[PDB]
Amino acid sequence: TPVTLAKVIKVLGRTGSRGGVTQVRVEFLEDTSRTIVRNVKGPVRENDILVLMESEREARRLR
Amino acid sequence: AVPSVQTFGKKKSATAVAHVKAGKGLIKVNGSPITLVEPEILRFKVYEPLLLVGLDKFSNIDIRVRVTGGGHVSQVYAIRQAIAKGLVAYHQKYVDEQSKNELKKAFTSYDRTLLIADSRRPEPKKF
Amino acid sequence: SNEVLVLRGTLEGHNGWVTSLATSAGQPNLLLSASRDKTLISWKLTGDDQKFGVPVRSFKGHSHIVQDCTLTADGAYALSASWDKTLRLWDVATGETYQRFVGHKSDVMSVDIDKKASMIISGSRDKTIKVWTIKGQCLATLLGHNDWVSQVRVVPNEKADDDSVTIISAGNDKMVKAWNLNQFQIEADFIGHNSNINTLTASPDGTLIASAGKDGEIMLWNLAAKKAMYTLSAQDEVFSLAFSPNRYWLAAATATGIKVFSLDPQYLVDDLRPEFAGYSKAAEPHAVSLAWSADGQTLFAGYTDNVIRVWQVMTAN
Amino acid sequence: QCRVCSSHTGLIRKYGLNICRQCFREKANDIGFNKFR
């Protein structure tokens, strides 16, 4: 299966109608030069492992 | 005369005084052996101070504890507060400190609330 | 050739800061140690360059910071001066103290014992000086200062007990006064320190009196001429002091390390400066109390992070 | 009894003082009751 093994680097801020989701900076482990953001929902901190499917199609920002 | 000390342990207004004496080794919970406490599921919570250091240091001891107060659940927590801190008074009056700290480190590595009781009292309502 | 001091051990038995260590003249195998954390700890000097073994006793009897501990030459008893107006007469075997004291209004700051074992002097932070019996009775209060007091010292009477005992005090009014016991009187007024006097010790001969305060003004005094021979500027803050018992080396415990001098001439042998880890460099730990051997061949140093290190006086190569 | 201030009900029968509670709030000081918590 196409796994996407990811590691959060920097936290940026909550965004949303309620701020229920958070935009962070995440890194890919298998390619350590992948600077990309991700709209992760939940309590987040440094140094987490992020399962993921759609490796490219992601909203860079929200209203 | 005999080496003898007193400790006590509390949880949620439930006290448990302890009398330490020296002898073949009898552990008396309010006039009964310790292997008969009625919350049968929590029977091993009282075994935890004994089953951390080995069954060795007790052919020279005698333990009589008695409790008041609390419910049927807190008194299980109260007895193992006074018992576990009851053993160190030998080793802080008679036996040396290197023997003291090795089990001091052994207890508080496993349970901070085996030595220090909790601090979570209740609260008044609609006032 | 010279006294180099290599690291010989490390003690970890406290969680305050140490306040006074104490060695026995008779027994060379133990160390009395007091600290800020309301504890008294007596050690076992297991000579080993990996550690020193056993803190053989603990003494749970007080309620606040203790300041200075003293004992006998052979190691028979022990005394303690904690901040809550309390003085305790300890044994050395069991832990059982004898009698508490009701005599002051402040922190009892410094005490001392005569070698004849009859009187115990006490200077406390309520600008008064008190003397006590062996059973612990009041004899006479003593006034004269107007600021606090830090250290009081009895003279080493090495002249075969020729009725010569006198008490020298480290006040807080930039003042160093000398107090007789046999006639109960002021003896000499020492003038010259410009700030808060921090520590004073005299020579092991009882002849050369050193005094040094907050500015780092090591002002030497004599026992009889009582003059300002040496006025050393330690250019720092010094906390406590150190005299080699057998040799003629006088040392000081500054906040910036550990400095040592010879009597004559002026030999800055070493700076005893230990090593730490993990610090922004405005945060290096430093010692406040230090002590010699019974033969001046080992030196102890307790620090703020509860480490007590030891060295040995071997010759320089 | 009806003591004073349009009350014969809500009397404080406890502690044997028998005061209409409308006329207790203004008399509870000099009896020696005071609120603290």
Next chain:
Amino acid sequence: FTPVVLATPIPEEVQQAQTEIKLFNKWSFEEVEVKDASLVDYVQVRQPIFVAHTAGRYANKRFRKAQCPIIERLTNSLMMNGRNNGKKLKAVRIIKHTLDIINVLTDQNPIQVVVDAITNTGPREDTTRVGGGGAARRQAVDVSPLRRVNQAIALLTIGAREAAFRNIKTIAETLAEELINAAKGSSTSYAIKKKDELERVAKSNR
């Protein structure tokens, strides 16, 4: 191993391997098993346990929440409605009557059958919990791992209540078959077949 005696007549069977580094009265913690890279950090609290009951202080900062044991967590979730709020002693009776009925069902480690089970049931994708501002839509989103474990365990639990509501079978009979169903990827249990269809429409919406 050398059963010493006291003036208390102590039974030997609480001293055989319990004085040895095996801790729990019937199982151990040598069996460490990592399946996902997310679970490597916090779920298997490497500490001993005997009864799975203590007064944890984890509810006053959201990451001390992680350090409580897994077995303690599942018992906490058994207080479900206005009949079992506070019957913790009832719950631990249920749980210690379930590992026995696990291992007699042709397997090797009763604590293993749940730690692999939550690997499947941590939902890798998600919807969003927003309408969208009139257009009640569902946009691109993913889940934090510490949030992932929370809903992972809880949906396994709630299926067992109606599985044991009003039918002859007991709770321990439900929790047996549910977790071994949850142990593999079968989607035959309600503990699985409601998290799956969440993820399938999440493969649509985004």
Next chain:
Amino acid sequence: IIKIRITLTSTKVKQLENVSSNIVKNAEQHNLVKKGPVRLPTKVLKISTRKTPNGEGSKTWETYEMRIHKRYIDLEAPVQIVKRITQITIEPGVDVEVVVASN
């Protein structure tokens, strides 16, 4: 020359440690046998009453308090020693009692 017992149950705690001090003062200047002032658990009074004269408005209440402290001393003395000193330790708000119970 009889064992006696004194009680004092007052409500001004500052004006009960002056009285209990001068009780043990003049007894010890005559050095009688005594046992120290045993201090009992205090008693509090309370009455909840809602805070409106009429009834029209939101609802929470008051709570009033009154504190009673009580301590007592046992004593033995010749009667001429005690019958004078119990008449010079008066103070308003303070109650004094003598009990000579020797059953």
Next chain:
RNA sequence: AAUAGUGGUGCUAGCAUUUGCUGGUUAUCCACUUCUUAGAGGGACUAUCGGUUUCAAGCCGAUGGAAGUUUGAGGCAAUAACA
């Protein structure tokens, strides 16, 4: 501290008995305050280190600590049309 409690000395019953573990109560008497109650004081200040920020006010971790969410909860505090 017989208007709380244990610790013995006893009178005293069991006692597997055999050293022993449970009892015995007014007054058998003495010695005790840890638990208990109430006076007098003490103790925490965000302490000490690591990050972060105009390096400021502060906010996050950390180990110690009975206690580190204003330490937990209350009491007390007047501008106004409910005639």
